[PDB]
Design a protein around this ligand. Structure first.
Ligand SMILES: Cc1ccc(Cl)c2c1NC(=O)/C2=N\NC(=O)[C@@H](C)c1ccc(O)cc1
Length: 286
């Protein structure tokens, strides 16, 4: 599709401007791995970046669909949303997606790291950053569909970026994706809103549900949600009105925010704008 080529054409990176270190794997996805790279800017300067391979996507129809769904991220710009540096097209291999290097890695491993020992205040602050990132995406009518602590990254300044979307979308920790759902594909069922598990539909309001789970992850420092609930049972567990329990170090007002995020009626759940307001107030009491 020439319209797609055109869009891709806006962000193309020449092969001679990119050095990929294929022996330095940052992470592994289903479409390909992420590698350390260096991008040479027009000024000739060296920029450390992350290079996402899509080489496991060999079918031209699949490559086209993936690029089509993801290319819009080139129009996004917000401090709490992962940006796209560009796309390297080549004679052999699927396109390479080039992104800013995130020096501190994914949020979940960061808070699980026992030497870090983030405080309640630190954790709420990260959650606030995610809420602002999602408020921006939501304002662009963009539904993430896989929001979770594992899928947010931290840059050198400890700014949290919502990642794993658009051209950067993949499954980066397979342990938390199950085919026990209506679509039969690997999905993050324990982050999914009840109505998404039932109807297979995703909206900004189901992103709000996932954000609620992400908040729970933050306050438990990266504990796995519903560890004693089988993937077979997650739908009925929720239908019964049951929810994740309040974390020991989660303040009562923040747990109320979580519960609001998991209201059975999607329209009754807060917007991300509301969430930024409420969480900001809570944060500032610290
Ligand atoms: C749990 C986990 C393990 C490994 C990897 Cl690679 C990732 C996650 N979770 C992610 O979201 C993710 N990667 N997500 C991304 O957007 C990719 C494109 C990316 C990776 C490293 C960068 O410095 C910059 C961007």
């Amino acid at each position: 599709n020439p319209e797609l080529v055109q869009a891709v054409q806006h962000v193309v990176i020449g092969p001679s401007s990119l050095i990929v270190h294929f022996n330095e794997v940052i992470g592994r996805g289903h479409f390909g791995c992420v590698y350390h790279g260096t991008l040479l800017d027009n000024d000739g300067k060296k920029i450390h970046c992350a290079v996402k391979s899509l080489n496991r996507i060999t079918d031209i129809g699949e490559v086209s669909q993936f690029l089509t769904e993801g290319i819009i991220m080139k129009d996004f710009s917000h401090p709490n949303v992962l940006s796209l540096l560009g796309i390297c097209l080549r004679s052999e291999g699927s396109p390479l997606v080039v992104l800013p290097y995130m020096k501190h890695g994914d949020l979940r491993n960061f808070i699980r790291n026992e030497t870090h020992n983030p405080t309640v205040k630190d954790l709420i602050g990260f959650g606030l950053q995610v809420a602002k990132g999602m408020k921006y995406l939501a304002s662009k009518k963009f539904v993430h569909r896989d929001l979770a602590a594992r899928n947010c990254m931290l840059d050198e300044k400890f700014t949290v970026k919502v990642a794993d979307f658009g051209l950067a979308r993949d499954m980066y920790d397979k342990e938390y994706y199950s085919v026990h759902n209506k679509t039969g594909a690997k999905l993050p069922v324990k982050w999914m809103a009840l109505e998404s598990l039932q109807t297979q539909k995703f909206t900004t309001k189901s992103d709000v549900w996932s954000f609620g789970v992400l908040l729970w992850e933050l306050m438990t420092r990266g504990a796995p949600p519903y560890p004693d609930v089988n993937t077979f049972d997650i739908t009925v567990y929720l239908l019964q009105g049951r929810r994740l329990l309040q974390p020991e170090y989660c303040p009562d007002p923040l747990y109320e925010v979580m519960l609001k995020c998991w209201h059975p009626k999607a329209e009754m759940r807060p917007s991300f704008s509301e969430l930024v307001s409420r969480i900001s107030a809570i944060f500032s009491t610290f």
